[PDB]
């Protein structure tokens, strides 16, 4: 491996990551906006349980999701056509990440929250919210990397809340140039939604191409995406 330094925002080539644990590449450093941005630019992300030092990753393969391949069951389509939810973009970044943090009775520590909150404040991290009237019932947040979106996590406090968030986002994302969504690691729910695994070099390749891409100037301003 390799320990980072408070000095620079330099990162070692992802290809020198460990095989097991898959993707472990470096430790230390900090969660400053600059260091974080660089992490994503180069296909790396932080992940570590509270108590441990900062750990950075770039797994092989990488879980990803082609927006157009999002699988939506027939029961969900029925649900979404008569949806009881409203979806918004960047209305409550803080609550969404907190919602993702309080899930599972998670590594999302206060420090991590502030760090991504800074990125949101600076205009790089964004959130999708799912509301059951006045209540935030689900959502997802991530870091925008051009036409590629790096999804950190999502949460659901009501049936189909997160499915709705993803469904609505993919429609809005594709409609304006969105090309790929990064899922980091593949999990059961994510896989059922059509997420798949591709080689790390394929992902980095895509990343380098898409970072350059641009969505419309206002794509990320706080707004209502879906309100039946």
Curated annotation (Swiss-Prot):
User: What Gene3D superfamilies is this protein classified in?
Assistant: Leucyl/phenylalanyl-tRNA-protein transferase, C-terminal domain, Leucyl/phenylalanyl-tRNA-protein transferase, N-terminal domain
Which Pfam families does this UniProt record tie to the protein? Leu_Phe_trans
A biological process term (GO) from this entry: protein catabolic process
Q: How does it assemble?
A: Monomer.
Task: Tell me the gene name.
Answer: aat
Any idea which GO molecular function terms this record carries?
aminoacyltransferase activity; leucyl-tRNA--protein transferase activity
Q: Which reaction does it catalyse?
A: N-terminal L-lysyl-[protein] + L-leucyl-tRNA(Leu) = N-terminal L-leucyl-L-lysyl-[protein] + tRNA(Leu) + H(+); N-terminal L-arginyl-[protein] + L-leucyl-tRNA(Leu) = N-terminal L-leucyl-L-arginyl-[protein] + tRNA(Leu) + H(+); L-phenylalanyl-tRNA(Phe) + an N-terminal L-alpha-aminoacyl-[protein] = an N-terminal L-phenylalanyl-L-alpha-aminoacyl-[protein] + tRNA(Phe)
Keywords, A to Z, come to: Acyltransferase, Cytoplasm, Transferase
Tell me what this protein is called. Leucyl/phenylalanyl-tRNA--protein transferase
Q: Does the keyword Cytoplasm apply?
A: yes
Where is this gene product found? Answer: Cytoplasm
Q: What is its EC number?
A: 2.3.2.6
Q: Which domain of life is it from?
A: Bacteria
Question: Which family, according to the similarity comment?
Answer: Belongs to the L/F-transferase family.
Q: Which GO terms describe its cellular component?
A: cytoplasm
Q: Does the keyword Acyltransferase apply?
A: yes
Q: What does this protein's UniProt record list under function?
A: Functions in the N-end rule pathway of protein degradation where it conjugates Leu, Phe and, less efficiently, Met from aminoacyl-tRNAs to the N-termini of proteins containing an N-terminal arginine or lysine.
